[PDB]
C-alpha cells in the first residue's frame, strides 16, 4: 500500500436530510351514476397520458380460466365492430402514439400518451376496444402461438419466475397464487371464447373502472367523454370478497448450472388498505437495499449484518481465522407486495452459489433472521428517521413523468377509492412512533411461518425447517 488513509482519523461532515415539498394541483375526481370513476391531475405542458384502469387482474381465476385475463388483453387489440386491427393501428399512427396494455395480478390498464388535442380520439379508441371488441373465435385460435411464445420468454426472466414461485407457494387454492399467463395446457386448448366472455361480463363493470388523465388534460372534458362513452356500463355484482389464506412453506427450483442463486423470504402482512400500510412501508425502507458496487457501504443494520460477514477476518482464540475470499452477495432488496386483503413483506437476495457444501448462504440467512428478530425487539431513533426520510424520497421518485403519475393515480383510485394527497400522506408519515413501528415488526416477523422461494444451487441454501427455527430466539 504505502499510501496512508487519512479518512480513518479525519473528522467528516455529515449531510442532513432536507425535504422539498413543491405543491401540486389537486387530483379532481368525479363519479357517474353508473359508478364509473373519472380522475385527473392537470399540469402545464403539451402532452398528456389518458388511460382506462380496470380492477380485474388474474387474481380471479380458478385454474380453469387461468390465463384468460392475458388472453382478453390480447383479444382486445384484434378489432371492434366499427374498426379493424389495421384501422386501430392507422388511427394510433396518425396520432403518433402507442397503445400500451399492462396486466398484473390485480389491476389492468390501457393507456395512451398523446397531445391535448388527440384526447377525444384516444378516449374513443380506448372505449371502442374495451366495450365493443368482437373477440371472434377464429382470432382466438390465431393468438395461441403468440401467447405460447410469450410464455416461453417470460419463463426466461429469473426475477419474474422467482416472484411467481413465491406467490404460488404463499397462496395455494386461490387465483392470487397463479401465473398471469397460465399453464400451456390452458393456452393451447382450454381457454375458449366462452371463458373470455364470462370473464369480461363478470369483471368489466361500472364501479370497477376508472378513466385517468395526467398532464395537459381537462377534467371537464374527461368527464364529458366518460359520460358519452362509459355512461352505459353495467353495474354488476360487487368484487368477490373471499378468504385468501397464507400457507407458509417453500418452493425450490434446482438448477445447478445457473451462475447465481436467488432467494426470496417473505412474511404475511395485512392488505393494501389496512391502517398498517404506512408502518409496513417504513419497515420496508428500514430493511433497505444493497448492491455489490457499494462494497462495505451498506446504510442499514440489515445489509451491514449480512455484508460484514464477508469482510470480518473471524479470528478466534481456539480456531484458525476463516475470512471469505471475496464478497459473494450480488444484491439485497426489501420488498412489499400488497393486495386488497393480503400482503407479502420480505427480502430478495442474489449471491453467488459458492463452493459445494459451503456456509455462505447459511451465514446470510442466519444474519438476516437475526436482524429481523432484532428489529422486532428494538429500533433506534436514527434508523427510524432514516427510514421515514427514505420513504418520503422513494414516494417522490415514483412520479417522474405523465405516465408514472397516471399509473399512480389509477392504482390509488382502484385501491383506496380516491387518491391520497401527498401532503396528507406526509402528514400521516411523521405521526408514526418508534414504539408503533416496533409493535408492527413484532406482530408479523417474530415466530411466524415464512414463505421461501429459491432458484439455483440448492445444495447450499438452507431448507425450510431450519429457516422456521430461526424466527424465534431462546432467550427472547
Amino acid at each position: 500500500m504505502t499510501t496512508p488513509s487519512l479518512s480513518s482519523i479525519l473528522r467528516h461532515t455529515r449531510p442532513i436530510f432536507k425535504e422539498t415539498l413543491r405543491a401540486a394541483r389537486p387530483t379532481l375526481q368525479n363519479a357517474l351514476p353508473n359508478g364509473f370513476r373519472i380522475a385527473s391531475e392537470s399540469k402545464d405542458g403539451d402532452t398528456c397520458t389518458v388511460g382506462v384502469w380496470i380492477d380485474a387482474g388474474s387474481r380471479w381465476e380458478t385454474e380453469k380460466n387461468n390465463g384468460v385475463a392475458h388472453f382478453l388483453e390480447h383479444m382486445n387489440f384484434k378489432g371492434t365492430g366499427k374498426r379493424s386491427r389495421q384501422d386501430i393501428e392507422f388511427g394510433m399512427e396518425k396520432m403518433g402514439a402507442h397503445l400500451n396494455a399492462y396486466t398484473s395480478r390485480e389491476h389492468t390498464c390501457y393507456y395512451v400518451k398523446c397531445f391535448k388535442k388527440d384526447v377525444p380520439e384516444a378516449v374513443d379508441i380506448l372505449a371502442d376496444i374495451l366495450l365493443n371488441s368482437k373477440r371472434t373465435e377464429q382470432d382466438l385460435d390465431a393468438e395461441r402461438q403468440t401467447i405460447v411464445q410469450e410464455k416461453e420468454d417470460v419463463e426466461a426472466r429469473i426475477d419474474e419466475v422467482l416472484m411467481d414461485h413465491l406467490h404460488s407457494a404463499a397462496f395455494e387454492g386461490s387465483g392470487l397464487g397463479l401465473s398471469i399467463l397460465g399453464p400451456l395446457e390452458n393456452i393451447q386448448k382450454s381457454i375458449t371464447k366462452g371463458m373470455i366472455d364470462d370473464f369480461v361480463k363478470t369483471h368489466y363493470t361500472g364501479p370497477r373502472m376508472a378513466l385517468v388523465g395526467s398532464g395537459a388534460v381537462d377534467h371537464g372534458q374527461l368527464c364529458d367523454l366518460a359520460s358519452k362513452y362509459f355512461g352505459a356500463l353495467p353495474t354488476g355484482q360487487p368484487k368477490p370478497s373471499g378468504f385468501t389464506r397464507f400457507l407458509g412453506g417453500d418452493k425450490r427450483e434446482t438448477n445447478q448450472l445457473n451462475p447465481l442463486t436467488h432467494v426470496a423470504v417473505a412474511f404475511q402482512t395485512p392488505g393494501i388498505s389496512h391502517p398498517d400500510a404506512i408502518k409496513i412501508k417504513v419497515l420496508e425502507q428500514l430493511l433497505g437495499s444493497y448492491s455489490r458496487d457499494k462494497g462495505e457501504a451498506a446504510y442499514s443494520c440489515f445489509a451491514r449484518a449480512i455484508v460484514m460477514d464477508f469482510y470480518d477476518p473471524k479470528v478466534g482464540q481456539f480456531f484458525r481465522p476463516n475470512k471469505a475470499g471475496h464478497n459473494p452477495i450480488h444484491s439485497l432488496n426489501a420488498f412489499w407486495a400488497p393486495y386488497s386483503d393480503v400482503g407479502l413483506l420480505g427480502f430478495y437476495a442474489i449471491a453467488e452459489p459458492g463452493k459445494s457444501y459451503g456456509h455462505e448462504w447459511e451465514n446470510i440467512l442466519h444474519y438476516a433472521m437475526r436482524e429481523l428478530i432484532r428489529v422486532s425487539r428494538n429500533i433506534s431513533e436514527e434508523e427510524f428517521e432514516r427510514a421515514k426520510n427514505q420513504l418520503k424520497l422513494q414516494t417522490m421518485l415514483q412520479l417522474d413523468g405523465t405516465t408514472n403519475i397516471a399509473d399512480d393515480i389509477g392504482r390509488q383510485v382502484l385501491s383506496f377509492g380516491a387518491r391520497v394527497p401527498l401532503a396528507s400522506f406526509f402528514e400521516q408519515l411523521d405521526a408514526i412512533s418508534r414504539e408503533d413501528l416496533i409493535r408492527v415488526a413484532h406482530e408479523y416477523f417474530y415466530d411466524k411461518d415464512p414463505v421461501v422461494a429459491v432458484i439455483g444451487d440448492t445444495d447450499n441454501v438452507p431448507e425450510y425447517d431450519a429457516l422456521r427455527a430461526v424466527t424465534y430466539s431462546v432467550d427472547l
Binding site: 500500500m1 488513509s5 487519512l6 479518512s7 480513518s8 443494520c301 449484518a305 433506534s380
Partner: protein, 228 residues
C-alpha cells in the same frame, strides 16, 4: 530521529515516544488468564520497556501528529503538483505521516541534554537490552520477529504483512529462512555482519499502525448503534 526536524516545526517533541511511557491505571482489565490469580488483576506489573503498546495509538495527539505531517505533504503537492509522488513515499521515509522509529535507531545520536535521569536510564537500557537478545547477530531485524500465529492470530499483523511491497516481503522471508538455518546449529553471522543499531529499521510498524487506524475507522462512524 530522522523525523525530528519535521517534529521540530510542528511544535512537537524531537524525542522518541518510547520515553514518556507511563502507567495510568491500577487494574489491568479485562483480566487475562493464564496469569496467576494476583497477577491476573494486574496490580503488580513486570515490563522490560519493549512491549508493543498498540492500544496507545487510540489518542488525539497521535492523530494530530499524523495529520500535521500529511498536511505538510499536501501543501508541498499543491505547490509543486507531484501529488502522486508525495502520496507514494515508502513508509520508511521520514516525511511519511506514519513514520515510526525504534528507540535504538537514535539512541547513539540523541540530544541527551533534555532527558531526565530516568530517561537516560531508559536509553542505556534500550541499547543494552537490544544487545542481550542477539537478534542482530542472526542477521535479523526486530520487525522480522513480529510473526502471526496459527490460532488467536493477530489480525492487524497479517494485513500489515500483505501491504508490504513484494520485494520487501521476499527479503523478510529470506532473512527468516536464513535465521532458521543459523538457529539449527545456534550459529551467528560473522562479527563484521552484525546489525548496527541504526540499521535496525522498523519497516513494519507504519503498516501495522495504518491497519489499526483503518480498522477503527468504522467503529467511530457507525451506521447505527446496533450494527455489525
Amino acid at each position: 530521529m530522522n523525523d525530528a526536524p519535521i517534529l521540530a516545526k510542528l511544535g512537537l517533541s524531537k524525542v522518541n515516544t518510547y520515553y514518556f511511557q507511563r502507567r495510568k491505571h491500577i487494574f489491568a482489565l479485562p483480566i487475562t488468564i493464564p496469569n496467576f490469580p494476583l497477577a491476573a488483576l494486574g496490580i503488580f506489573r513486570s515490563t522490560d520497556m519493549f512491549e508493543e503498546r498498540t492500544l496507545e495509538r487510540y489518542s488525539r495527539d497521535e492523530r494530530e501528529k499524523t495529520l500535521g505531517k500529511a498536511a505538510l505533504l499536501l501543501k508541498e503537492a499543491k505547490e509543486k503538483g507531484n501529488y502522486s509522488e508525495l502520496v507514494r513515499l515508502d513508509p520508511t521515509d521520514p516525511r511519511h505521516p506514519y513514520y515510526f522509529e525504534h528507540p535504538w535507531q537514535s539512541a547513539l545520536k540523541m540530544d541527551t541534554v533534555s532527558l531526565t535521569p530516568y530517561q537516560q536510564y531508559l536509553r542505556w537500557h534500550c541499547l543494552t537490552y537490544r544487545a542481550m537478545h542477539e537478534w542482530d547477530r542472526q542477521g535479523l531485524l526486530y520487525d522480522d520477529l513480529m510473526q502471526p500465529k496459527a490460532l488467536a492470530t493477530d489480525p492487524f499483523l497479517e494485513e500489515a504483512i500483505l501491504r508490504l511491497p513484494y520485494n520487501q516481503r521476499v527479503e523478510r522471508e529470506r532473512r527468516l529462512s536464513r535465521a532458521y538455518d543459523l538457529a539449527l546449529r545456534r550459529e551467528y553471522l560473522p562479527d563484521e555482519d552484525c546489525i548496527h543499531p541504526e540499521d535496525d529499521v522498523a519497516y513494519l510498524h507504519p503498516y501495522y499502525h495504518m491497519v489499526v487506524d483503518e480498522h477503527r475507522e468504522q467503529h467511530e462512524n457507525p451506521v447505527d448503534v446496533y450494527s455489525r
